[PDB]
Every structure is written in structure tokens, then in C-alpha cells.
């Protein structure tokens, strides 16, 4: 319902609220299915590379999948 109502948001805050809602939906997916969560994580990272929680969660999921074989990514994020 929040995503449906996002169409009525003022354009100034529309980008920020869309990013927030997509992050929340990606969290719900990560609870349900990690693949869609990672997809939305990539979508938001392309949309806003400056956000940290998205990158943290994406790298954390990658480390879970790669058994901590992305130490370079963690160092770069640090």
C-alpha cells in the first residue's frame, strides 16, 4: 500500500521516499528470499551509491554466499 501511495508523493521527496521504500521491500525480501533482496540492493546502489546500509547488507549477503571470500569488498567499504 505504501508503494502504491508513492505515486502520489511530491516530486521533491519522491526520490528519497522511493529509495526508503525500496530498501524496506529489499529487507522484507531478504527475510523471504535473498535473491530479490540482492537484486533490489543492486538497483538502489545504482540509484544511490552513497547509501551505506544497502551496501553493508549486499556485501554481507555476498559474504554469506561466498563464505567470506570478498575481503577486498569489505576493506573497500571500510
Amino acid at each position: 500500500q505504501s508503494l502504491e501511495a508513492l505515486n502520489n508523493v511530491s516530486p521533491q521527496n519522491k526520490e528519497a521516499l522511493s529509495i526508503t521504500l525500496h530498501y524496506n521491500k529489499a529487507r522484507v525480501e531478504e527475510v523471504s528470499n535473498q535473491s530479490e533482496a540482492e537484486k533490489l540492493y543492486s538497483k538502489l546502489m545504482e540509484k544511490c551509491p552513497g547509501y551505506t546500509s544497502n551496501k553493508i547488507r549486499y556485501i554481507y549477503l555476498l559474504a554469506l554466499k561466498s563464505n567470506g571470500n570478498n575481503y577486498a569488498d569489505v576493506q573497500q567499504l571500510l
Binding site: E15, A16, C48, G50, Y51
Partner: peptide, 6 residues
Amino acid sequence: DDPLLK
């Protein structure tokens, strides 16, 4: 520096 991030 991004007003969007702020």
C-alpha cells in the same frame, strides 16, 4: 555533500 542523502 548530496542534499538527497541529508
